Amino acid sequence: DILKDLSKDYDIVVVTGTNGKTLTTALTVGILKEAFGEIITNPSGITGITSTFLAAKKGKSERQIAVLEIDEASLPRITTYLKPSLFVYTNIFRDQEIYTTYQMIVDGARNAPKATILANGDSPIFSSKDIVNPVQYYGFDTAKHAPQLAHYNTEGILCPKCEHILQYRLNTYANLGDFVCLNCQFQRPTLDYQLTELTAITHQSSEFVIDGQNYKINVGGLYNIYNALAAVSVAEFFGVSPEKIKAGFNKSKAVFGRQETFTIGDKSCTLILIKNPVGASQALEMIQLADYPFSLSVLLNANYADGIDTSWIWDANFELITQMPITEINAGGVRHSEIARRLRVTGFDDTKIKQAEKLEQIIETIEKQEAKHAYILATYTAMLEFRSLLADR
């Protein structure tokens, strides 16, 4: 039909979850293409799906595969229109109740009970409920330590079987990792796809082993490793050879983008968007890995596109700055006063935290600093303004 018969012609992979949908989809498409040729996908996404399937060069007698990013809320509706063969669940985190958001994708997959679910085993949500569909799991199986609590600002850490607090033999970020309830021994399932080795990780790259083969990406962040893991897992499930996964991966890894780097005088600068606590903490954990001295600038606006509420910065892990090679700190943006205070409270040297009322001043200061590198963390409208001021030079 308008979208139904294509589910019979195509093997349809639906990629859903809170974060990483777009990147996991783009990387999966690129690996599957190496094995199977043309892959239908929605590079930005229901009636518009009809044209994508209609542009297709392959016909009915060729191996037709679609990898589609579907929003968590739109899944029950689209699962009536088209029947996927595989669901991929990247993760679930809270918008600004998660168990209600998980219910929608449980429902959407229930509409295609034969389809396999490939879920992030490291999320305790994805083992919270009994499920009709066959499930397999990917996750991190690197070296474990003794069970320890996640950081107290972490969300979603109750055991769904006994309502005690989960601990972790390995915690990557947020509530992800090798979780274990010490009261009822509910715990992370055996992983079908294993990241077994983290071999090198920097502020701008990582190398890791997944099911006996090594991979390298050229951006930092653990969350990006999860995206590569999920895609490689889809390719293994589709039976793609290790040689073809590697070649497909290396052709498609550029979808990760690069760090937004530029120059102010002789200083090399990186600009990073911050918008919520887990995201900002992941950026701080990334830049902490830099092996050189650097200045840190943090730009906080409260405009509409930023989120009028700035209380979130108190849950971001800015305490990490005392463990970083930071030479001097700039506090900018409209709420330069509130961010300066957030940074003082970490115990960082307050004589090295300088407030600036105008972003231009931030640029002049970075321009004359002693250190060769500068990191700039910026909310959204502050990032746009900061790029626009760089244009004028």
């Binding site: 996640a150 509420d309 957030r342 115990g347």
Partner: protein
């Protein structure tokens, strides 16, 4: 119980302040846990070495171990789970409060100090019942927006942001944290906001409150220190340790 935060050994502290972060890994939303960071920061400035323990489900609480209890807000589900565990800490928290020791309680924590709260869907959840206030629900409405209150016992003004469906009514043996200048306050009816009973300070304010009200941060920490070491000690002035914050609080206007 475990220690989540501890002052460095980069200063020489003359005092020790131990903070019990009640259910701090379950009631941990909206930035309210930044109140803990502000307590630590003010306390260090006053010469106190800060230890923060997370005292949550199934932990025993010993009133004698702690100088400040912080009890913040969380999600409806977590809040109902916290409520299930509170009888295990009732006797010790009652003794702590009766001994006039310092409590700061925000949203769900403020509510749970009292008799009960009612979810928007009508389900009543019993609280510790230590204090006499109680909290009713609203069916659909929420009180949302900026709020400004003034406490006439101290002559201090506090600012923040409210977002709550619960309507709290104080009992006759309680005072409000402040009278409402603009905002909904506890019930939208009587111009009260929060609670002040002995050394319990409760509020619906997000902010976090101590980030936006350093006057109250100083009050809580100095009260705790004088309670522990006696009213005769001489602490550094509000104006001298918090000059930068006091002026920048005004530059926002």
């Amino acid at each position: 119980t475990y220690t989540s935060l501890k002052s460095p050994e980069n200063q020489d502290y003359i005092y020790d302040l131990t903070i019990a972060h009640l259910y701090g890994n379950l009631m941990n939303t909206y930035g309210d846990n930044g109140n803990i960071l502000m307590l630590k920061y003010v306390a260090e400035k006053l010469g106190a070495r800060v230890t923060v323990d997370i005292v949550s489900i199934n932990d025993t609480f010993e009133q004698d171990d702690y100088d400040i209890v912080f009890f913040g807000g969380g999600q409806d589900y977590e809040q109902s789970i916290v409520a299930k565990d509170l009888p295990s800490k009732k006797a010790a928290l009652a003794d702590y409060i009766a001994n006039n020791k310092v409590v700061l309680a925000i949203c769900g924590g403020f509510q749970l100090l009292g008799q009960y709260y009612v979810q928007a869907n009508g389900v009543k959840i019993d609280g510790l019942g230590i204090m006499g206030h109680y909290t009713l629900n609203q069916h659909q409405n929420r009180f949302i927006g900026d709020i400004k209150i003034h406490n006439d016992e101290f002559n201090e003004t506090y600012y923040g942001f409210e977002n709550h469906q619960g309507r709290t009514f104080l009992s006759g043996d309680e005072k409000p944290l402040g009278r409402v200048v603009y905002g909904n306050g506890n019930n939208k009816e009587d111009q009260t906001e929060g609670v002040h009973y002995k050394n319990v300070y409760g509020s619906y304010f997000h902010g976090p409150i101590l980030s936006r009200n350093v006057n109250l941060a100083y009050r809580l920490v100095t009260t705790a220190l004088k309670k522990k070491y006696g009213s005769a000690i001489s602490l550094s002035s509000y104006d001298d340790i918090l000059k930068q914050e006091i002026t920048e609080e005004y530059a926002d206007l």
